[model samples]
Target: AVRGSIIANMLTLYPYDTNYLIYTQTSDLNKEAIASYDWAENARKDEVKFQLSLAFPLWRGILGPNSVLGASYTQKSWWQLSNSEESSPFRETNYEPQLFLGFATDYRFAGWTLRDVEMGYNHDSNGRSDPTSRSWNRLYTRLMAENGNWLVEVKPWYVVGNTDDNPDITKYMGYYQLKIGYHLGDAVLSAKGQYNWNTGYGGAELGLSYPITKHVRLYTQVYSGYGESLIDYNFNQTRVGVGVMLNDLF
Candidate 1:
């Protein structure tokens, strides 16, 4: 990220969110889900996690103000911070690189709504070799609308490539996600759920953030279900934590 007036539209924090999950769980505690990943064995059950996303603007005003071509990279990592070992290790890491069109528009349904639309292609994976490798590509679209003080986003994504890498991924990770949030004053209440209707497996993530300043937030999050992490895609989990968030709740 750069500072100055002229470069304000260039590169920015596109999808950055980070927190420490103090509690976590799964069905099996010692099963080798991904061979050497230690998904269940260590659980990284009570771990520290983080995600960072930044986007560079290519062109602006495509359809209206706040509309632009953007490329973003989001990275998430889980660390075994409280491990008994002399040195803590990073348990898992996942990366997502996206290229998309982000457009801001107003749609009227009685009143103006549908604040924005972001449609794009994204590649997600863990940069690990066979035995522990995982990767997938998808074509996805997201639309955000506001009603009263609540904002909602319903995103449906289609898997496009690398099915063989993780054939049963869809069963645990799902094909669609629904997110909703209520904002009042400087506090936020939000929930996100993703489900695979066919396999009847899914997960839920809930978050609460109160503003400490304009750009800093004190965050508390609880996540329960499967797919809490890429390596834990097929494992069920319950994680809880309270930390600081770089940006406001999303």
Candidate 2:
């Protein structure tokens, strides 16, 4: 039998500004049942991950935003897994923590956009002896334009190794997205094109949202994309889900 696993995630936004975020996730898998199933060999028997972040606005301007600063920390644990799995497995209870800092800014004038920059650092420890730990720094820049009902953005970023054990690979990444929407009563029909250039991955999303009762909204979205290391996946995935938002709910 193919047993199903339950994953739980809890998130909290501090100060109600949507700038600071904290979350935790836990997954429990039935190893004995999974071993008997075809897709259970690579399954994680039990795991937990926690993340915390703080973002603050540094400056803003009419032509361009001046600067912003943020910091984040993450800790992840895996049970009964090997370190060579590329996904950083934790065998028999292992823990790893990482810290990151970043800054970003943008400037625009006339029909031309001047600059957009972002930089960050990441570190990971797999809990093994052999100096297998790694760390790297990343930098991203983009240039784009916007007009009435139409907008285009192109962002390119690079990664550099800060440790000897870290991969020497330099990633040159970019993204292009176009969004269009139409108003229908209190609802909107939205379509977007999202493109990424790292391993050459791109995708699109189409969705609709409407006010069901003025205080609540009914929304549905579906998306497919590739090379999404940002989402911890490299292939394509199709997901259909619903969401509800209340502007004021006590």
Candidate 3:
């Protein structure tokens, strides 16, 4: 029998549907929205966008068989790299951290497998103060299922505390989100959408990625509607970006 390797059983970074860098352009610069800031006058529509997400498992089988407790952090930033007039400042950055418990399942129905179920406490913020600050907290749950090359995930959440910075956040960001993905040979196509039934406001994002190397892929994505960022939660716009992704949605 082979001996166990300590490193193999140590905590490691697990996947959580994000990790990429891209050059993006938006349809509207929305400068007027941020006109309060003196340095934002020269803000442009084109910018550099990137996201880093890392998830680590804390305890396995903590609650029962196939159950895990984990923690994750994600940061997404919009950098005005080409705006020399503004000294190429970062337009906005959102920070998110979550603590969750997940259980892997093998429930099968109609050729589909229930991959996992997870519930978590999530917090998102811009890490700013006063008028520019935006933050929210939620208790959320995720259910994922797969069949053949298709995968689907449904996430529903409830806002827990006050949203002083964005009182009407639910109107545009919605109470739930849906994600779907398909694997096509060497490429992966994914889409994400969210909607608020009461306000009829939400957003959609489509992504396509193709393998370039064993560990990387060329990625492109487009987003439309609202809530691209907390500061721009109510602003409607379309944006497109091309970049590289370190992993696939699946």
Task: Identify the runs in model 1 with alpha carbons over 4 angstroms from their true place.
Answer: 1-31, 34-44, 62-66, 84-86, 110-112
Q: If both were scored by TM-score, which would come out higher, candidate 1 or candidate 2? A: 1
Query: How displaced is residue 113 in candidate 3, in Å?
Result: 0.8
| Candidate 1 local lDDT, 116-143, one digit each (tens) | 5778898888877877777888899877
The TM-score between candidate 3 and the true structure equals 0.93
lDDT of each: 0.69, 0.35, 0.83
- Over 218-237, each residue of candidate 2 has an lDDT whose tens digit, in order, gives 66554555421221223354
Put down candidate 3 lDDT per residue, 193-228, tens digits, no spaces: 999988889999999999899889999999999999
| Index of the highest-TM-score prediction | 3
Clashes of 3: 0
Where does model 3 exceed 4 Å of error? Answer: 1-12
Ranking of models by lDDT: 3, 1, 2
Candidate 1 differs from the real structure by a C-alpha RMSD in angstroms, to one decimal, of 4.5
